[PDB]
Amino acid sequence: HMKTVLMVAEKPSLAQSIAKILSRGSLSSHKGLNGACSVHEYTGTFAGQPVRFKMTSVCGHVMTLDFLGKYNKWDKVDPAELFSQAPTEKKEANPKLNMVKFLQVEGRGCDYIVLWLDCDKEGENICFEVLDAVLPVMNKAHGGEKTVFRARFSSITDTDICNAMACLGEPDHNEALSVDARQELDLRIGCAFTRFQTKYFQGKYGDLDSSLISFGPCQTPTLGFCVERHDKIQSFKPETYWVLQAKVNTDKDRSLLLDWDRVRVFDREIAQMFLNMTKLEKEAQVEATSRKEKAKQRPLALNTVEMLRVASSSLGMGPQHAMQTAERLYTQGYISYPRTETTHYPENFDLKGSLRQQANHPYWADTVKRLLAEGINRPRKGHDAGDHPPITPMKSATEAELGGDAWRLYEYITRHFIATVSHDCKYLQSTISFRIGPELFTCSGKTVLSPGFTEVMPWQSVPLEESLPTCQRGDAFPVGEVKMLEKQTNPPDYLTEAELITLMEKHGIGTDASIPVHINNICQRNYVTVESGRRLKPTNLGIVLVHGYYKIDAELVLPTIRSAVEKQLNLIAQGKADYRQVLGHTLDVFKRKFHYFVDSIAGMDELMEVSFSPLAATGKPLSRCGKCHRFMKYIQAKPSRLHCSHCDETYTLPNNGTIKLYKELRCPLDDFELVLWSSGSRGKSYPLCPYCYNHPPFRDMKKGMGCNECTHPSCQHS
Amino acid sequence: MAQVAGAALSQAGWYLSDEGIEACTSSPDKVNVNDIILIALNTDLRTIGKKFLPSDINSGKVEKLEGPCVLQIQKIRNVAAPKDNEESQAAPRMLRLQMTDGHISCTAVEFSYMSKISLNTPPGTKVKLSGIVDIKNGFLLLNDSNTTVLGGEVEHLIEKWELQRSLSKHNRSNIGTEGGPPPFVPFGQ
Ligand SMILES: [Mn+2]
Ligand SMILES: [Zn+2]
Ligand SMILES: [Zn+2]
Ligand SMILES: [Zn+2]
């Protein structure tokens, strides 16, 4: 009798596509009892027997982690026993789908299972969840014969699904455990901190909503970069610099604008003497002329990081939106899996076939035809992490059959592929150096000799400039005018999405394409606003939260613990780590840090009272800030403070006494203006730096003691 | 003896005052110009010396510093870089050398690439200007053709210059403090 084999995909559309590819057209299909997934049947061969097939799909994740319910109530719980005392369970993950029961009834009679889940690390978790759901209801088999199978693939394309079938393997429990460990770590640490903060701040301040405060091992580190950029913006000190500019006349009308070698000078008198060296002179003598050939390198293969960066900077699409559009394009079968960190094409790749697919699109037609006619240039060598091939086209698409942002992303992916398999852009860089008086200026220009990839990527084309005059050495040219400028250095702009992607990739926080998830989380929670140019402007709530976190414990914000944890998860994935050991270690260190957070939450309560309470933020102005050069308000609450409105920071001052200005003098280490402390009854008063009283500059002195024992060789007051 | 030794010292270019020579002595029967040089290099220039720099160099009415004149560095600042970086390689570095004779303080500008003088040169380092050096609009112009770095090591103002190390005080992180947050021990194997 004919036996049966079962298949599971991550999406019903993927299930239908793969079933059509494998079944060669002949395919029965009917809807399941869940109302959202359909099952497809046909007849083929497995192992060495003629067998029936039964392919179905899941709806994303099938099981989601939470607590036992009794511990899920935030009102009545001790939000410190969620670390290593509260049990965890994967409950249902949208019980409206009844996926567990659907899988059980589908696999009620089965002998083999093959899982067509996404080949990312997250896919193995769903693979093993489906295995746990379906294993008890299948046949025990005669014994020893392999039953569970795993299909490895990167694109939903013909003969690619076939070669995935030809080399079936096994799932990776190490990757499944890595995903589970990450989920448990987040669900424990973030929920514990968020529950404690929600219980603490609840109706305490009028303008602060309790539910809007949250903490995460990744959300807080990725918000730290935005708040650090905001702090640099708010603590910028503009400085004036002077640039000399020389204009020379070539033949009769052309005016070359020469630029100075020294670029800039930050001293007005130095700029004045350099102009006095120059303004009287009425000739310029050319010294060196160089026309050297240079090549602009092709872009490497497209990975998810670069795809998100470009989709943000150029296409004006957010990280999560770009990820969803790329996943959809992969689902229909237009591009490969867009969760790749490899920028090097494998040797056994059909680059010529991929080029031949896009030989009819009007936009890139002549370039592809000439590339096929001549030889195909090898792509640049890159990183070979062993994941899927880079994000590359796999099927021809037109704006009519595609849509909007999806078509734009497909166009960028195809253009990147064509640029990778192309020639370098070649340009000559002409540099002419002039001597005016004792100074020497220069002028540079670029002339394109042969546009290579800078025809499929016009936005990377070398800008066109008029050719510099052909002047031999020892030629004298008239100079029209030379004058200095009064340019001022500009403050940095807010951190863009692409820059955030780069920073998260550099510091290690965010792996397995979770950076879009983290960015979208910190955008949905109103901590950053997406201003024009895709700029992440931190909000008041986010700034105050991260400043309080930094005040209490820097490692809660800095991207070090998360980087180490993600590295240990990677070693979990590559079979060399202990899941229990790493989970316990991380839970223990974060439990100690949470105990310190509870015992030292007073620092955060202060910045929240002066920021989110309108009836307790009014005070008399006092000594300047040390980062802003702006007045700081002196609050008369029980924990007497010193609040700066520009930079959202507060400084604690001694109680049971008065605070008065100390003759405008300034601390020579932090730039803050030090104030005196009158200790009640008639007696001595000692100086006190507002920033040093809260953040000591030396290890020996602890928090909350003034310049009486400042332990500083400078700061004469000590 | 002592007088001809001082005359040879002046000819070599260390314009010191007779009080300075009498302060920088050896066994009081014979002193050698090498000994005076060695003692002076370790001695701050303000304590000893005389006045050969005219009291008009900062005014701008002079344009010549003829003579092998020895001066002492008091402060180095990169004028091609802003006060927040001091290391940005967006412009060739040019040094504003504050130099002194112990009596009148003058300023010079690095008109070329002087590899001998760097931003880490300790204050009190002695610089000898030889041949003809040109003043214009205040500042001197200095390059390799006339400036020689004659070592220099004077403990009190090098310890004062240790305020450069004191300036780099990024230790204000509250990590590892006795009364501070628990530290993150690195993961084991
Ligand atoms: Mn997935
Ligand atoms: Zn401020
Ligand atoms: Zn201070
Ligand atoms: Zn002090």
mmCIF file of N, CA and C in Angstrom, chain A residues 236 239 261-267 269-270 273-274 276-277 438-439 552-553 555 561 564 568 582 585-586 592-593 596 669-670 691-692 695-699 703 712 714, chain B residues 77 79-84 88 90-92 94 96 109-112 136-137 139 141 163 166 169 171-177 179-188:
data_model
loop_
_atom_site.group_PDB
_atom_site.id
_atom_site.type_symbol
_atom_site.label_atom_id
_atom_site.label_comp_id
_atom_site.label_asym_id
_atom_site.label_seq_id
_atom_site.Cartn_x
_atom_site.Cartn_y
_atom_site.Cartn_z
ATOM 1 N N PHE A 236 27.089 71.090 21.847
ATOM 2 C CA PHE A 236 28.041 71.509 20.829
ATOM 3 C C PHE A 236 28.510 72.926 21.118
ATOM 4 N N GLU A 239 32.736 76.958 16.914
ATOM 5 C CA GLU A 239 34.044 77.591 16.860
ATOM 6 C C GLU A 239 34.264 78.169 15.470
ATOM 7 N N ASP A 261 45.592 74.402 0.752
ATOM 8 C CA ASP A 261 46.098 73.145 1.292
ATOM 9 C C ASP A 261 45.832 73.042 2.786
ATOM 10 N N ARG A 262 46.031 74.138 3.520
ATOM 11 C CA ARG A 262 45.828 74.115 4.962
ATOM 12 C C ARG A 262 44.357 74.049 5.341
ATOM 13 N N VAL A 263 43.455 74.146 4.362
ATOM 14 C CA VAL A 263 42.021 73.953 4.549
ATOM 15 C C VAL A 263 41.455 75.043 5.447
ATOM 16 N N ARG A 264 41.804 75.011 6.730
ATOM 17 C CA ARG A 264 41.211 75.919 7.697
ATOM 18 C C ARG A 264 42.250 76.352 8.719
ATOM 19 N N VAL A 265 42.021 77.537 9.278
ATOM 20 C CA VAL A 265 42.834 78.094 10.352
ATOM 21 C C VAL A 265 41.887 78.625 11.419
ATOM 22 N N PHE A 266 42.151 78.278 12.678
ATOM 23 C CA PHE A 266 41.272 78.631 13.784
ATOM 24 C C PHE A 266 41.760 79.853 14.555
ATOM 25 N N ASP A 267 42.709 80.605 14.000
ATOM 26 C CA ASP A 267 43.220 81.817 14.630
ATOM 27 C C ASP A 267 43.034 82.986 13.677
ATOM 28 N N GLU A 269 44.314 86.010 13.815
ATOM 29 C CA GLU A 269 45.563 86.690 13.488
ATOM 30 C C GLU A 269 46.392 85.883 12.494
ATOM 31 N N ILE A 270 46.390 84.555 12.624
ATOM 32 C CA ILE A 270 47.084 83.715 11.653
ATOM 33 C C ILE A 270 46.437 83.846 10.280
ATOM 34 N N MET A 273 47.516 87.248 8.835
ATOM 35 C CA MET A 273 48.872 87.287 8.295
ATOM 36 C C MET A 273 48.985 86.466 7.016
ATOM 37 N N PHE A 274 48.251 85.352 6.920
ATOM 38 C CA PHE A 274 48.271 84.583 5.680
ATOM 39 C C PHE A 274 47.609 85.343 4.537
ATOM 40 N N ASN A 276 47.671 88.705 4.396
ATOM 41 C CA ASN A 276 48.670 89.726 4.100
ATOM 42 C C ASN A 276 49.802 89.163 3.255
ATOM 43 N N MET A 277 50.094 87.870 3.405
ATOM 44 C CA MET A 277 51.058 87.205 2.537
ATOM 45 C C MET A 277 50.586 87.137 1.091
ATOM 46 N N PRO A 438 53.930 83.194 -0.630
ATOM 47 C CA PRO A 438 54.485 82.011 0.044
ATOM 48 C C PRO A 438 53.503 80.859 0.168
ATOM 49 N N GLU A 439 52.237 81.051 -0.185
ATOM 50 C CA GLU A 439 51.237 80.009 -0.017
ATOM 51 C C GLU A 439 51.046 79.219 -1.309
ATOM 52 N N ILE A 552 22.004 55.432 36.658
ATOM 53 C CA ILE A 552 21.946 54.323 37.607
ATOM 54 C C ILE A 552 23.019 53.283 37.294
ATOM 55 N N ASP A 553 23.096 52.844 36.040
ATOM 56 C CA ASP A 553 24.062 51.822 35.640
ATOM 57 C C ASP A 553 24.353 51.998 34.159
ATOM 58 N N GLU A 555 26.124 50.209 32.069
ATOM 59 C CA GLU A 555 26.073 48.999 31.254
ATOM 60 C C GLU A 555 24.656 48.640 30.825
ATOM 61 N N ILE A 561 27.023 44.323 27.223
ATOM 62 C CA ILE A 561 26.401 43.099 27.718
ATOM 63 C C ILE A 561 25.607 42.420 26.611
ATOM 64 N N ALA A 564 28.028 40.751 24.167
ATOM 65 C CA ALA A 564 28.546 39.499 24.712
ATOM 66 C C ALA A 564 27.484 38.406 24.697
ATOM 67 N N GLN A 568 27.598 34.853 22.698
ATOM 68 C CA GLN A 568 27.401 33.554 23.330
ATOM 69 C C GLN A 568 26.250 32.790 22.687
ATOM 70 N N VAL A 582 24.854 29.715 30.016
ATOM 71 C CA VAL A 582 24.786 31.105 29.575
ATOM 72 C C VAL A 582 23.504 31.764 30.068
ATOM 73 N N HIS A 585 23.948 32.483 33.798
ATOM 74 C CA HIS A 585 24.932 33.576 34.008
ATOM 75 C C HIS A 585 24.261 34.920 33.721
ATOM 76 N N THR A 586 23.633 35.054 32.551
ATOM 77 C CA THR A 586 23.012 36.321 32.182
ATOM 78 C C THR A 586 21.896 36.688 33.152
ATOM 79 N N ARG A 592 21.361 40.811 39.740
ATOM 80 C CA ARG A 592 22.133 41.699 40.605
ATOM 81 C C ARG A 592 21.975 43.153 40.173
ATOM 82 N N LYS A 593 22.022 43.407 38.863
ATOM 83 C CA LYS A 593 21.843 44.772 38.380
ATOM 84 C C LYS A 593 20.437 45.286 38.664
ATOM 85 N N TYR A 596 20.335 46.309 42.304
ATOM 86 C CA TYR A 596 20.955 47.626 42.431
ATOM 87 C C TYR A 596 20.043 48.720 41.884
ATOM 88 N N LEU A 669 37.582 71.232 35.479
ATOM 89 C CA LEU A 669 37.590 69.858 34.992
ATOM 90 C C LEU A 669 36.319 69.562 34.203
ATOM 91 N N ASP A 670 35.179 70.114 34.641
ATOM 92 C CA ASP A 670 33.876 69.801 33.986
ATOM 93 C C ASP A 670 33.225 71.063 33.405
ATOM 94 N N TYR A 691 28.535 68.977 39.168
ATOM 95 C CA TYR A 691 28.761 67.741 38.431
ATOM 96 C C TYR A 691 29.669 66.766 39.164
ATOM 97 N N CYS A 692 30.642 67.263 39.925
ATOM 98 C CA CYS A 692 31.529 66.393 40.685
ATOM 99 C C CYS A 692 30.869 65.830 41.934
ATOM 100 N N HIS A 695 28.883 62.988 39.993
ATOM 101 C CA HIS A 695 29.790 62.107 39.258
ATOM 102 C C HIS A 695 31.219 62.413 39.681
ATOM 103 N N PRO A 696 31.800 61.633 40.589
ATOM 104 C CA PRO A 696 33.156 61.929 41.041
ATOM 105 C C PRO A 696 34.145 61.777 39.905
ATOM 106 N N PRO A 697 35.200 62.594 39.888
ATOM 107 C CA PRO A 697 36.216 62.467 38.835
ATOM 108 C C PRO A 697 37.293 61.451 39.176
ATOM 109 N N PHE A 698 37.446 61.143 40.461
ATOM 110 C CA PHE A 698 38.468 60.225 40.934
ATOM 111 C C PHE A 698 37.819 59.042 41.641
ATOM 112 N N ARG A 699 38.485 57.889 41.556
ATOM 113 C CA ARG A 699 37.914 56.655 42.090
ATOM 114 C C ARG A 699 37.786 56.704 43.607
ATOM 115 N N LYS A 703 30.323 59.090 45.773
ATOM 116 C CA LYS A 703 29.245 60.002 45.315
ATOM 117 C C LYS A 703 28.644 60.779 46.482
ATOM 118 N N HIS A 712 42.190 66.326 43.882
ATOM 119 C CA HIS A 712 42.539 66.764 42.546
ATOM 120 C C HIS A 712 43.741 67.697 42.614
ATOM 121 N N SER A 714 44.718 69.886 40.448
ATOM 122 C CA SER A 714 44.191 71.176 40.023
ATOM 123 C C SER A 714 42.939 71.479 40.856
ATOM 124 N N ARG B 77 49.388 74.292 20.591
ATOM 125 C CA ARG B 77 47.995 74.147 20.192
ATOM 126 C C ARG B 77 47.919 73.969 18.686
ATOM 127 N N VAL B 79 46.242 74.678 15.454
ATOM 128 C CA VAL B 79 45.304 75.660 14.923
ATOM 129 C C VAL B 79 44.566 75.139 13.693
ATOM 130 N N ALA B 80 45.026 74.035 13.108
ATOM 131 C CA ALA B 80 44.317 73.410 12.001
ATOM 132 C C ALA B 80 43.188 72.499 12.462
ATOM 133 N N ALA B 81 43.055 72.270 13.766
ATOM 134 C CA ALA B 81 42.037 71.401 14.328
ATOM 135 C C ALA B 81 41.263 72.131 15.420
ATOM 136 N N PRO B 82 39.985 71.815 15.603
ATOM 137 C CA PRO B 82 39.186 72.504 16.620
ATOM 138 C C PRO B 82 39.523 72.014 18.024
ATOM 139 N N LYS B 83 38.961 72.718 19.009
ATOM 140 C CA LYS B 83 39.242 72.441 20.413
ATOM 141 C C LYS B 83 38.611 71.149 20.913
ATOM 142 N N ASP B 84 37.748 70.509 20.127
ATOM 143 C CA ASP B 84 37.102 69.284 20.579
ATOM 144 C C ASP B 84 37.797 68.024 20.081
ATOM 145 N N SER B 88 41.762 65.609 14.257
ATOM 146 C CA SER B 88 41.066 65.371 13.000
ATOM 147 C C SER B 88 42.015 65.570 11.825
ATOM 148 N N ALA B 90 41.561 66.245 8.714
ATOM 149 C CA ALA B 90 40.900 66.909 7.600
ATOM 150 C C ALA B 90 41.694 68.097 7.080
ATOM 151 N N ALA B 91 42.839 68.397 7.695
ATOM 152 C CA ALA B 91 43.705 69.489 7.304
ATOM 153 C C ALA B 91 45.101 69.162 7.807
ATOM 154 N N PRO B 92 46.145 69.487 7.048
ATOM 155 C CA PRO B 92 47.506 69.294 7.559
ATOM 156 C C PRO B 92 47.706 70.081 8.842
ATOM 157 N N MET B 94 49.095 72.306 11.695
ATOM 158 C CA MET B 94 49.972 73.460 11.811
ATOM 159 C C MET B 94 49.983 73.902 13.266
ATOM 160 N N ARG B 96 50.894 76.274 16.578
ATOM 161 C CA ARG B 96 51.081 77.622 17.110
ATOM 162 C C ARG B 96 51.959 77.493 18.350
ATOM 163 N N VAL B 109 54.562 80.262 14.225
ATOM 164 C CA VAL B 109 53.675 79.368 13.496
ATOM 165 C C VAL B 109 54.522 78.428 12.648
ATOM 166 N N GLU B 110 54.124 77.157 12.623
ATOM 167 C CA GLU B 110 54.819 76.137 11.846
ATOM 168 C C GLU B 110 54.501 76.342 10.369
ATOM 169 N N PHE B 111 55.447 76.911 9.626
ATOM 170 C CA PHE B 111 55.246 77.234 8.220
ATOM 171 C C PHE B 111 55.506 76.051 7.296
ATOM 172 N N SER B 112 55.888 74.905 7.844
ATOM 173 C CA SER B 112 56.172 73.703 7.071
ATOM 174 C C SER B 112 55.784 72.510 7.938
ATOM 175 N N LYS B 136 56.344 88.217 11.002
ATOM 176 C CA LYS B 136 55.439 89.045 10.217
ATOM 177 C C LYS B 136 54.053 89.036 10.841
ATOM 178 N N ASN B 137 53.478 90.233 10.971
ATOM 179 C CA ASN B 137 52.173 90.430 11.597
ATOM 180 C C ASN B 137 52.115 89.744 12.958
ATOM 181 N N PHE B 139 53.406 86.922 14.657
ATOM 182 C CA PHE B 139 54.021 85.608 14.775
ATOM 183 C C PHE B 139 55.283 85.464 13.927
ATOM 184 N N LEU B 141 57.744 82.826 11.733
ATOM 185 C CA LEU B 141 57.578 81.673 10.854
ATOM 186 C C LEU B 141 58.708 80.687 11.118
ATOM 187 N N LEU B 163 48.859 67.964 33.424
ATOM 188 C CA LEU B 163 47.466 68.368 33.286
ATOM 189 C C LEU B 163 46.903 67.997 31.920
ATOM 190 N N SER B 166 45.617 64.805 32.907
ATOM 191 C CA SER B 166 44.476 65.123 33.760
ATOM 192 C C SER B 166 43.262 65.553 32.943
ATOM 193 N N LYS B 169 39.901 62.677 31.198
ATOM 194 C CA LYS B 169 39.316 62.142 32.421
ATOM 195 C C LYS B 169 37.994 61.452 32.118
ATOM 196 N N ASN B 171 37.199 58.675 32.877
ATOM 197 C CA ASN B 171 36.926 57.714 33.938
ATOM 198 C C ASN B 171 35.635 58.008 34.688
ATOM 199 N N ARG B 172 34.953 59.112 34.377
ATOM 200 C CA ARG B 172 33.704 59.477 35.045
ATOM 201 C C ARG B 172 32.549 58.619 34.522
ATOM 202 N N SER B 173 32.682 57.307 34.728
ATOM 203 C CA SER B 173 31.686 56.346 34.282
ATOM 204 C C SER B 173 31.005 55.599 35.418
ATOM 205 N N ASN B 174 31.564 55.644 36.630
ATOM 206 C CA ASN B 174 30.915 54.993 37.803
ATOM 207 C C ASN B 174 30.804 53.485 37.562
ATOM 208 N N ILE B 175 31.843 52.868 37.001
ATOM 209 C CA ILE B 175 31.878 51.433 36.743
ATOM 210 C C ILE B 175 33.026 50.846 37.551
ATOM 211 N N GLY B 176 32.722 49.841 38.369
ATOM 212 C CA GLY B 176 33.709 49.237 39.237
ATOM 213 C C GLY B 176 33.942 49.963 40.544
ATOM 214 N N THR B 177 33.221 51.052 40.798
ATOM 215 C CA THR B 177 33.361 51.770 42.056
ATOM 216 C C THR B 177 32.880 50.900 43.214
ATOM 217 N N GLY B 179 31.142 51.657 45.936
ATOM 218 C CA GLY B 179 29.721 51.871 46.123
ATOM 219 C C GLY B 179 28.987 52.075 44.815
ATOM 220 N N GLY B 180 29.218 51.191 43.847
ATOM 221 C CA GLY B 180 28.651 51.348 42.529
ATOM 222 C C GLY B 180 27.914 50.119 42.039
ATOM 223 N N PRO B 181 27.528 50.129 40.760
ATOM 224 C CA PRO B 181 26.767 49.005 40.221
ATOM 225 C C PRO B 181 27.631 47.762 40.122
ATOM 226 N N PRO B 182 27.035 46.577 40.206
ATOM 227 C CA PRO B 182 27.800 45.340 40.009
ATOM 228 C C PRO B 182 28.365 45.274 38.603
ATOM 229 N N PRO B 183 29.576 44.749 38.440
ATOM 230 C CA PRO B 183 30.186 44.676 37.112
ATOM 231 C C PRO B 183 29.776 43.417 36.359
ATOM 232 N N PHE B 184 29.915 43.493 35.037
ATOM 233 C CA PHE B 184 29.603 42.371 34.153
ATOM 234 C C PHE B 184 30.877 41.564 33.938
ATOM 235 N N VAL B 185 30.981 40.434 34.626
ATOM 236 C CA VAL B 185 32.136 39.549 34.443
ATOM 237 C C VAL B 185 32.051 38.891 33.071
ATOM 238 N N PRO B 186 33.159 38.763 32.338
ATOM 239 C CA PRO B 186 33.096 38.125 31.019
ATOM 240 C C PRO B 186 32.687 36.663 31.118
ATOM 241 N N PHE B 187 32.069 36.192 30.032
ATOM 242 C CA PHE B 187 31.541 34.807 30.011
ATOM 243 C C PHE B 187 32.674 33.792 30.021
ATOM 244 N N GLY B 188 32.449 32.670 30.693
ATOM 245 C CA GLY B 188 33.414 31.596 30.764
ATOM 246 C C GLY B 188 33.350 30.686 29.552
#
